[PDB]
Design a protein around this ligand. Structure first.
Ligand SMILES: O=C1CCc2ccc(OCCCCN3CCN(c4cccc(Cl)c4Cl)CC3)cc2N1
Ligand SMILES: CCCCCCCCCCCCCC(=O)O
Ligand SMILES: CCCCCCCCCCCCCC(=O)O
Ligand SMILES: CCCCCCCCCCCCCC(=O)O
Ligand SMILES: CCCCCCCCCCCCCC(=O)O
Ligand SMILES: CCCCCCCCCCCCCC(=O)O
Ligand SMILES: CCCCCCCCCCCCCC(=O)O
Length: 578
């Protein structure tokens, strides 16, 4: 604790230290060029080495916030590039870093990163691996200034492994592109869950987050006592509360302390934490958050004894309601790791609603005597949706499943723009193929995680340009009722059909020369416009048009004159049967 930067350097190692220092500066000086950040990192790294050689060297006793802030305020172009951020450099350190944190631009006006060609990437990866990888780590950090820097380093090493493996293969793009796409989607999803959880914390209070934490931790750690789960929920709530604040050092120390406690109490938490409590301090907390569920105890009794049958239900509930409800959620969650967290919260709220009415009634024991019967329809509702949607997914393929969702959701809310209907239907289709490859024991948790990012992304684009009231209603609802609200959407019978546009249903020779993905998006776009023009069209009528369209595209591939002549016949023949 004498020299804090030296302790960081020796715990993290030189390689990880430089990467984290690059990420940290890129998240505050988002508008500075890459070569300026490399200059700061090398200067900070050479300074850290003097503290490692002599803890008593000058300025080595200063705190990390003081050293970081002081270094940040030496940037010559600070005031010219960052207007009122330079005014932070006139405040004491307790208030200076707070001032710096208030100017982290969430969505800066930076151009979209372009994925270069595969050959130019592998060539650059070979010619200068260090600057190639670090430039892109810089480009991502400056675009996600609130993304937890060690997790950004965790993905960065996955990018390095992808280039190392696939730049030596016979077909580079054969395995590099699928890995890069998988990394892109996974990174954008992780960055979405983090920002979404932080927004939910402030909008629905700390109590709603603790309930979620009790459910999740009991599924992961079913063998731990309730007191151990409740203690972890309190610490996890403090970790997520301060990590949402944005301070990197305070967030990292909280996560390190929790992982340090969990690894010292493995015998009272889980038996699955063995492999990752041996990992270095940089990776411990990250892995524990992704550890698989431990096995639940063998013969666990029914919940009716403590929560329905025996007396003192209202008495034990009235003494401390959230504790009693927390025990119910703990006992229910750890017996059902196959449930989604939100489903467990629906049952807790249902049990809560019952006690608040029953404990004030004439005969309370008679009142809640069958509270478990109310849980059956709530449990069976998502279980039937998974079976129904993936018996349909098994009848079709992924692309044909997306077309079914596309027709179904366009009918329900025709007011949503076509690009949003296309994008969400394709993503919701990816949830089908991603999760129904799993067995029944882990289908609902899979769907919950993937639906929550698609449904929030749906309203992230919808909140900016609101069109449909029924979509905003489902996203103003709590995260527990969000998915059932969207499932409860009915076909809009008050929607007048869209005016026919000839240029919309016009097709040129570009579709045959476009890529497979670009051809699908173009075909799926016209399918939305077909449903918006004729919502009352039936399944067999739409299939006839889709079959004729596929035959129209295949027959026309002369090619230019076919799309115009055969296209005029397709449009007219469809207008006679719709
Ligand atoms: O040289 C390369 C190779 C890799 C690559 C892929 C896509 C690409 O262009 C797409 C446009 C920007 C997409 N980014 C991808 C990374 N992504 C993200 C967000 C949070 C965490 C994490 Cl870990 C991540 Cl990855 C943000 C959005 C360019 C490149 N450039
Ligand atoms: C140990 C106390 C943990 C927190 C108390 C659990 C209460 C569960 C009630 C469930 C209803 C609220 C769910 C929500 O708002 O998201
Ligand atoms: C150099 C600055 C170091 C700040 C980041 C430390 C990362 C420690 C992460 C530990 C954890 O996630 O539990
Ligand atoms: C993924 C939620 C936790 C993110 C904060 C990192 C804390 C890591 C140690 C706590 C592990 C909690 C396990 C869990 O996610 O249920
Ligand atoms: C389409 C992807 C499969 C459909 C899954 C729908 C059921 C999701 C249940 C989530 C929840 O508990 O609210
Ligand atoms: C487009 C509007 C979003 C559609 C709702 C997605 C919910 C996931 C499927 C659940 C269901 O099939 O009922
Ligand atoms: C007015 C009707 C004009 C023709 C409408 C074109 C509809 C195109 C839908 C394409 C979806 C199926 C694609 C395929 O079968 O591969």
């Amino acid at each position: 604790h004498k020299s804090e930067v030296a302790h960081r350097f020796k715990d993290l190692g030189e390689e990880n230290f430089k990467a984290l220092v690059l990420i940290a500066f890129a998240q505050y000086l988002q508008q500075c060029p890459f070569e300026d950040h490399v200059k700061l990192v090398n200067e900070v790294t050479e300074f850290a080495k003097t503290c490692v050689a002599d803890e008593s060297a000058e300025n080595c006793d200063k705190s990390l916030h003081t050293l970081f802030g002081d270094k940040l305020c030496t940037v010559a172009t600070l005031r010219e590039t960052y207007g009122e951020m330079a005014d932070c450099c006139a405040k004491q350190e307790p208030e200076r870093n707070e001032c710096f944190l208030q100017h982290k631009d969430d969505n800066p006006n930076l151009p979209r990163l372009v994925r270069p060609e595969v050959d130019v990437m592998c060539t650059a990866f070979h010619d200068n691996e260090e600057t190639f990888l670090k430039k892109y780590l810089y480009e991502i950090a400056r675009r996600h200034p609130y993304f937890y820097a060690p997790e950004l380093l965790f993905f960065a090493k996955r990018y390095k492994a992808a280039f190392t493996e696939c730049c030596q293969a016979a077909d580079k793009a054969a395995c590099l592109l699928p890995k890069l796409d998988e990394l892109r989607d996974e990174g954008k999803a992780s960055s979405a869950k983090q920002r979404l959880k932080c927004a939910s914390l402030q909008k629905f209070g700390e109590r709603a987050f603790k309930a979620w934490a009790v459910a999740r931790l009991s599924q992961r750690f079913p063998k731990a006592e309730f007191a151990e789960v409740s203690k972890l929920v309190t610490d996890l709530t403090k970790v997520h509360t301060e990590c949402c604040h944005g301070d990197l050092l305070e967030c990292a120390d909280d996560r390190a302390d929790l992982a340090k406690y969990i690894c010292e109490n493995q015998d009272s938490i889980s038996s699955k934490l063995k492999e990752c409590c041996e990992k270095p301090l940089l990776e411990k907390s990250h892995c524990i958050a992704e550890v698989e569920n431990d096995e639940m105890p063998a013969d666990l009794p029914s919940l009716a004894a403590d929560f329905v049958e025996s007396k003192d239900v209202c008495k034990n509930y009235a003494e401390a309601k959230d504790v009693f409800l927390g025990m119910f959620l703990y006992e229910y969650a750890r017996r059902h790791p196959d449930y989604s967290v939100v489903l467990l919260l629906r049952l807790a709220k249902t049990y809560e609603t019952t006690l608040e009415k029953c404990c004030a009634a004439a005969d309370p024991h008679e009142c809640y005597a069958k509270v478990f019967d109310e849980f059956k329809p709530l449990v069976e509702e998502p279980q039937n949706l998974i079976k129904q949607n993936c018996e349909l997914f098994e009848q079709l393929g992924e692309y044909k499943f997306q077309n079914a969702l596309l027709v179904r959701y366009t009918k329900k809310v025709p007011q949503v723009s076509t690009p949003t209907l296309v994008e969400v239907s394709r993503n919701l289709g990816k949830v089908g193929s991603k999760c129904c490859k799993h067995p029944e024991a882990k289908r609902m948790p899979c769907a919950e995680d993937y639906l929550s990012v698609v449904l929030n992304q749906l309203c992230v684009l919808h909140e900016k340009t609101p069109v449909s009231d029924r979509v905003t209603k489902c996203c103003t609802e709590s995260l527990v009722n969000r998915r059932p609200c969207f499932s409860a959407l009915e076909v809009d019978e008050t929607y007048v059909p869209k005016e026919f546009n000839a240029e919309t249903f016009t097709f040129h020779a570009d579709i045959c020369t476009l890529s497979e993905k670009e051809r699908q998006i173009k075909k799926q776009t016209a399918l939305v416009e077909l449903v918006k023009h004729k919502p009352k069209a039936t399944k067999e009528q739409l299939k006839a048009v889709m079959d004729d369209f596929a035959a129209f595209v295949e027959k026309c591939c002369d090619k230019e004159t076919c799309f115009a002549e055969e296209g005029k016949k397709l449009v007219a023949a469809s207008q006679a049967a719709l």
